[PDB]
């Protein structure tokens, strides 16, 4: 149950990376913001992988 939480921590870090990159480019001509999409990694149901 450690890898499952580590994966969520990594996903939150990626989200915050995207948010910081968007903020840093607040005034940058021709910049289009980014958005991170997440999907679970269920193996065979009844157990999660992160």
């Amino acid at each position: 149950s450690f890898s499952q939480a580590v994966s969520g921590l990594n996903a939150a870090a990626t989200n915050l990376d995207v948010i910081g990159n968007n903020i840093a480019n607040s005034a940058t001509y021709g910049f289009k913001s980014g958005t991170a999409s997440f999907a679970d990694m269920f193996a065979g149901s009844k157990v999660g992988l992160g």
Partner: protein, 260 residues
């Protein structure tokens, strides 16, 4: 090697399963179209010893005999199918469901999975696909010369070409509903496949006999509630620690006996 040790070795495993469910729910707090899990437990064997209700004398029965029980086992983790809050992220390719239906998607091997994630993209050939690159059904192609994509509340996908005042219909999006939404088998990547406990896939149009409504520019977020997961972590941690204390007490009891 002793009964209480096995019982407390089942308690540990059940609480570890509960922690696994909680951690998996908290890790996917941001994935769109997610349904959180709930683990259910049930009692194991019950050793009869003196039978409850046994006829001790010829007229007196024994009430509630010596029923020593075994530990616990989890039946399953069931998906709590509720409507997640919709978010207005204002893109023409994001669609959200308002009822209890599913999108049908064709897997590369020829079989069909079912997903409630509405973040759709367009491939190089112009077909609507899931963000994982799986093509949606019953196939909605989008021309190269497209100016705006309009997906209505009934699932009709329309594309307006250049300089033309009337939209062009390029397909019709349908929703699949099941008798039992919990019995679907999750295969990851926000995809569920049909299982015999989920009945049969009933295809329906969005607004009729029970398919949900589609809203364009909206994404369905997860139904995971953070505070409840925090409280559940605090209670699962305490239960695990107490069962470990039971293990330790059994270990100490076995020590003195052997030393004798």
């Amino acid at each position: 090697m002793i009964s209480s040790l096995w019982i407390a070795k089942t308690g540990l495993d059940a609480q570890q399963t509960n922690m696994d469910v909680i951690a998996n729910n908290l890790a996917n707090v941001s994935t769109n179209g997610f349904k959180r899990q709930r683990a259910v437990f049930e009692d194991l064997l019950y050793q009869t010893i003196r039978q409850p209700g046994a006829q001790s004398s010829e007229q007196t029965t024994l009430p509630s005999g010596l029923q020593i029980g075994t530990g616990v086992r989890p039946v399953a983790t069931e998906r709590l199918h509720s409507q997640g809050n919709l978010s207005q992220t204002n893109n023409s390719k994001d669609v959200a469901i308002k009822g209890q239906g599913f999108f049908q998607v064709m897997l590369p091997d020829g079989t069909s999975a079912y997903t409630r994630d509405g973040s759709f993209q367009v491939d190089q050939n112009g077909q609507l696909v899931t963000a994982g690159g799986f093509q949606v059904q019953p196939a909605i192609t989008i021309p190269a010369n497209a100016l705006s994509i309009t997906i209505g509340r009934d699932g009709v996908v329309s594309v307006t070409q250049q300089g033309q005042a009337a939209p062009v219909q390029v397909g019709q999006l349908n929703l699949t509903t099941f008798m039992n939404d919990t019995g679907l088998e999750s295969i990851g990547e926000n995809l569920y496949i049909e299982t015999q406990s989920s009945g049969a896939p009933n295809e329906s149009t969005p607004g009729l006999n029970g398919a949900g409504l589609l809203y364009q520019g909206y994404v369905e977020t997860s139904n995971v509630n953070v505070a409840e997961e925090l409280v559940n972590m605090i209670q699962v941690q305490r239960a695990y620690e107490i069962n470990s204390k039971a293990v330790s007490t059994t270990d100490q009891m076995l020590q003195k006996l052997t030393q004798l």
